[PDB]
Amino acid sequence: SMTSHSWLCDGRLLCLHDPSNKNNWKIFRECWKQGQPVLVSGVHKKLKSELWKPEAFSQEFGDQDVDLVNCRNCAIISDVKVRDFWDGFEIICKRLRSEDGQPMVLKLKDWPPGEDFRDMMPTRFEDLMENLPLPEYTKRDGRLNLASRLPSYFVRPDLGPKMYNAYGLITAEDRRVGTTNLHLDVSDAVNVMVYVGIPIGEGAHDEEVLKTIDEGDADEVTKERIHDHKEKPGALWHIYAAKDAEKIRELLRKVGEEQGQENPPDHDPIHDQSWYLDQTLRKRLYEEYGVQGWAIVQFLGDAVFIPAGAPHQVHNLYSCIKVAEDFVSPEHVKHCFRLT
């Protein structure tokens, strides 16, 4: 039976089922006021699927110059053509190779660059912005988006959206690396999975993906979305409450010191964007500091709502295209104020 919502993370995460329902705010706003993330499924069914394919991005934009990041070691690959990234998205035998001769796991850095998404891709911009869930919060002019209404005493988000494109992490060693390291934003964000690419050439890679989700602490209902409904999983997220950010900074100062980093006692390991919390570090955070997070698997068409101030990290299971929009809800406006 079609239902308004369900729960993940053993009751700790709201999952809304219908992305465009005018009644969603009534369920959403109580969870949001408490500083919880929220998942909305089914956004892919609202979009024009032909606009969100890796082959179309290569054909239309392939001659642009870009930088890539090697996710395994954080090395920058400078001034290559964007087709060198897109043509290897799903076909492993076409990927740029490291010196060891392996195909690299790559992230496309800042593309489209800065605020240029709308100018470069006007049909994509329209398709995304018209189908975002919770539109009074997420649209540039929504009644509960304060972004366009605040004075300079508040940090205002840039004009979006922003596109986040990266290969899937593959090996047992890759389980300890992030696609995007632990960081926080002073604005709220909605992040939509518009495409998941399951590769070929080393296709048969299904078992390291299950072990990553299991060791990632994903709940039993999340696991049933794969085995029972055959949905395509894109990325594993860990999100922490804004109120736990300083305890996470204390853990990462102690670990920085154990590993022989030499940091001033006030330095900010979350702002540095240099850490990925692996199974060892997540268990340490829980046992030693009393901090629990939310382990979230984002499937094709899932929109993840990330509260302002909430530390979070992302680990791609397969090749992903994500599009995100920042906004300023009244619930969380304290996080972007420049005083006290």
Contacts of 36 by beta carbon, 8 Å cutoff, 6+ apart = 12, 13, 14, 241, 294, 307
What burial class does residue 195 get, using C-beta atoms within 10 Å of its C-beta: 0-12 exposed, 13-18 middle, 19+ buried?
buried
Q: Which of 322, 314, 290 is nearest to 238 (CA)?
A: 314
Residue number, 27 or 150, with CB nearest to ligand S4V:
27
- Per rule CB under 6 A, is residue 58 in the interface with ligand S4V? no
Minimum distance from CB of 8 to ligand S4V (Å)?
16
Under 8 Å between Cβ of 44 and 128: no
Classify strands 38-40 and 13-16 as parallel, antiparallel or unpaired: parallel
Residues 279-318 that bind ligand S4V (CB under 6 A): none
Residue number, 23 or 261, with CB nearest to ligand S4V:
23
Token pair, residue 152, equals 């300079």
Residue number, 138 or 180, with CB nearest to ligand S4V:
138
183 appears as a binding residue in the annotation: yes
> Which entry of ligand S4V, Cl ion, none binds 180, CB below 5 to 8 A by partner kind?
Cl ion
Residue number, 23 or 59, with CB nearest to ligand S4V:
23
Classify strands 162-166 and 106-108 as parallel, antiparallel or unpaired: antiparallel
Please tell me the count of residues contacting ligand S4V according to CB under 6 A: 8
**What CA–CA distance (Å, rounded) separates 236 from 194?**
15
Residues near Cl ion, by CB under 5 A: 25, 35, 121, 123-124, 134, 136, 180-181, 242
Q: Report the alpha-carbon angle 76-73-177, nearest 5.
A: 125
> Which entry of Cl ion, ligand S4V, none binds 289, CB below 5 to 8 A by partner kind?
none
Residues 2-41 that bind ligand S4V (CB under 6 A): 2-4, 17-18, 21, 23-24
What's at 45, amino acid-wise?
K
> Which entry of Cl ion, ligand S4V, none binds 62, CB below 5 to 8 A by partner kind?
none
Element (H or E) spanning 126, and its range?
Answer: helix 122-129
- The sign of the dihedral angle between the CA atoms of 38, 42, 46, 50 is positive
Under 8 Å between Cβ of 157 and 114: no
> Which entry of ligand S4V, Cl ion, none binds 123, CB below 5 to 8 A by partner kind?
Cl ion
If one counts every other C-beta atom within 10 angstroms of the C-beta of residue 67, the result is 15
Minimum distance from CB of 248 to Cl ion (Å)?
15
Helix, strand, or coil (residue 72): coil
Q: Which string of x and - marks every residue 129-168 that binds ligand S4V (by CB under 6 A)?
A: ----------------------------------------
**What CA–CA distance (Å, rounded) separates 87 from 92?**
9
188 appears as a binding residue in the annotation: no
> Which entry of Cl ion, ligand S4V, none binds 18, CB below 5 to 8 A by partner kind?
ligand S4V
Residue number, 25 or 61, with CB nearest to ligand S4V:
25
> Which entry of Cl ion, ligand S4V, none binds 134, CB below 5 to 8 A by partner kind?
Cl ion
Minimum distance from CB of 226 to Cl ion (Å)?
26
205 appears as a binding residue in the annotation: no
- Per rule CB under 6 A, is residue 64 in the interface with ligand S4V? no
**What CA–CA distance (Å, rounded) separates 96 from 69?**
12
Q: Which of 116, 315, 59 is nearest to 209 (CA)?
A: 315
Residue number, 38 or 226, with CB nearest to ligand S4V:
38
Q: Which residues are annotated as a binding site?
A: 183, 185, 312
Binding site for ligand S4V (CB under 6 A): 2-4, 17-18, 21, 23-24
Q: Which residues are annotated as a binding site for Fe cation?
A: 183, 185, 312
